Ligand binder design. Structure first.
Ligand SMILES: [Ca+2]
Lengths: 219, 99
């Protein structure tokens, strides 16, 4: 294998592991930093680490800071990979973000050619680059904002955005995207929203958030 | 005629003797339009300066406003109304009345 200890899903792909599924990656290629991840090996040539999935509402996403810090759920079903993990992975180099969404047979996506999450001291602030896609650019609203949960309010609203809109996110006052919100909830802004695609009174039944090194475009 | 029902569960909750945490819930019904923002209208109940004031929120999702510079031990009467994108106004909340 070209990469004995792959540090992302794109290095698995280069090894010949081109089937989507669960794989181990090793942060900075060091064996002691093993992390289990789900690799999407088919979207736009493959090589994406999936760090969030919603698909049936059987998993509770209305959790607290400590839960969103460490991660929760099953990587083959609905899950959140963990903010500490996302920070550590996006610090390995320049990553891109892709959000894929589906409503039955209709599909859309949004991509951002830079993606990072800051460390805990900086409250996991979101940094994104330039948009391409079909879903509309609803995530740039959230540029530079810290992460908030129902028990840790870091938004700039008088209200508690995470409590009012049943989620956990980089809230401002409050959101145009709410992908950790309440599954199937059509009430205004409380559900899984991507505003520019379906508005605030439609909850998206399938969504995946995923990341890949920018330099995979060269290969 | 109204573009929404009234904001519900308007709570005053004094933060201290001079600051008021006004919160509400989004109107349950919005008629043929969208809510753009909210206005908080208030005036002193007692004393001699019954001039009403108004504070405008930023956006349609932040369901609250902090009112400061409220004279301590003074009673105030407040109302919240939605401002819709079509220029109409919703039903005014119930009037609500500092330690
Ligand atoms: Ca807040």
């Amino acid at each position: 294998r070209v990469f004995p200890h792959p540090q992302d899903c794109a290095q698995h792909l280069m090894n010949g592991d081109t089937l989507s599924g669960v794989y181990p990656i090793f942060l900075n290629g060091e064996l002691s930093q093993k992390l289990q991840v789900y690799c999407d090996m088919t979207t736009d040539g493959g090589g994406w680490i999936v760090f969030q999935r919603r698909q049936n509402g059987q998993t509770d996403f209305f959790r607290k800071w400590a839960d969103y810090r460490v991660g929760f759920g099953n990587v083959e079903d609905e899950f959140w990979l963990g903010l500490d993990n996302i920070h550590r992975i996006t610090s390995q180099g320049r990553y891109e973000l892709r959000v894929d969404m589906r409503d039955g047979q209709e599909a859309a996506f949004a991509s951002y050619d830079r993606f990072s999450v800051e460390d805990s001291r900086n409250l996991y602030k979101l940094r994104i680059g330039s948009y391409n896609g079909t879903a509309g650019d609803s995530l740039s609203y959230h540029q530079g904002r810290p992460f908030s949960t129902e028990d840790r309010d870091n938004d700039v609203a008088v209200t508690n955005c995470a409590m009012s809109y049943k989620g956990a996110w980089w809230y401002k006052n409050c959101h145009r995207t709410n992908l950790n919100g309440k599954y199937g909830e059509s009430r205004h802004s409380q559900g899984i929203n991507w505003y520019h695609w379906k508005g605030h009174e439609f909850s998206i039944p399938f969504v995946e958030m995923k990341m890949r090194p920018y330099n995979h475009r060269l290969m | 005629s109204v573009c929404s029902s009234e904001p519900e569960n308007v709570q005053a909750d004094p933060e201290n003797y001079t600051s008021l945490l006004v919160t509400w819930e989004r109107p349950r019904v919005v008629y043929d339009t969208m809510i753009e923002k909210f206005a908080v209208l208030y005036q002193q109940l007692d004393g001699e300066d019954q001039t009403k004031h108004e504070f405008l929120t930023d956006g349609y999702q932040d369901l609250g406003a902090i009112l400061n510079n409220l004279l301590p031990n003074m009673s105030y009467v407040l109302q919240i109304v939605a401002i819709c994108t079509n220029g109409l106004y919703g039903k005014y909340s119930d009037q609500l009345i500092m330690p």
